[PDB]
Design a protein around this ligand. Structure first.
Ligand SMILES: Cc1cccc2c(=O)[nH]c(-c3ccc(CN4CCC(N(C)C)CC4)cc3)cc12
Ligand SMILES: [Zn+2]
Length: 205
């Protein structure tokens, strides 16, 4: 069982999570075709995810990664947008659902920028938009994304669009660069869905 703990907007933990969410919005070449047209979000609530078994898989895998990377797990807080968010908070990240069409191959993707993860809340290319109004730029429906603990360990920095089924020897993750940085992991137990964020994209005035 998963427990969702509501963080209060007065909490420094909440202020930190939203600040990171708001401050990392940037412009995309698709002119917001996938995620929608916005300059800001409207944060409805932020919740801490608590699952005893998913923390066991994650903490077990950190120990393994640090032994292979000189007592350093190189953990980063990264965004994740998925049409599978409900299955992640209950059963965890699963590499059997890796993004086949990814630039850096069949792995699990994470963004530094909330704007990039927002383009995947409804699927690849914004899917067919929100389930109610079939709108990729819907300002009514409450969207969701995760702010995750990601054990990167030894990252392999990639620049070319080279499809990899697994990380290169000695490495635990792949960082791809050219408009923004993409973080790829090949093991589901290398991310923990720390925060579940419920928000809306805002129609500019
Ligand atoms: C590219 C990228 C960069 C940075 C951040 C992100 C991010 O937040 N999410 C994703 C993302 C998430 C979920 C899905 C949907 N899956 C794909 C696999 C699929 N197959 C096996 C049938 C089933 C639906 C596709 C992409 C990509 C991404
Ligand atoms: Zn809608």
């Amino acid at each position: 069982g998963t427990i969702l703990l509501d963080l209060a907007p007065e909490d420094k933990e909440y202020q930190s999570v939203e600040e990171e969410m708001q401050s990392t919005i940037r412009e995309h070449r698709d002119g917001g075709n996938a995620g929608g047209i916005f300059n800001r979000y409207n944060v409805i609530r932020i919740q801490k995810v608590v699952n005893k078994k998913l923390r066991e898989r994650f903490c077990h895998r950190q120990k393994e990664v640090s032994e292979e990377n000189h007592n350093h797990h190189n953990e980063r807080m990264l965004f994740h947008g998925s049409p599978f968010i409900n299955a992640i908070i209950h059963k965890g990240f699963d590499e059997r659902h890796a993004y086949i069409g990814g630039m850096f191959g069949a792995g699990i993707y994470f963004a530094e920028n909330s704007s990039k993860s927002n383009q995947y809340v409804y699927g690849i290319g914004g899917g067919t938009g929100c389930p109610t109004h079939k709108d990729r730029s819907c300002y009514i429906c409450h969207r969701q994304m995760l702010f995750c603990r990601v054990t990167l360990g030894k990252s392999f920095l990639q620049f070319s669009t080279i499809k990899m089924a697994h990380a290169p020897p000695g490495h635990h993750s792949v960082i791809g660069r050219p408009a923004y940085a993409e973080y790829v992991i090949y093991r589901g137990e290398q991310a923990y869905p720390e925060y579940l964020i419920t928000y809306q994209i805002m129609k500019p005035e």
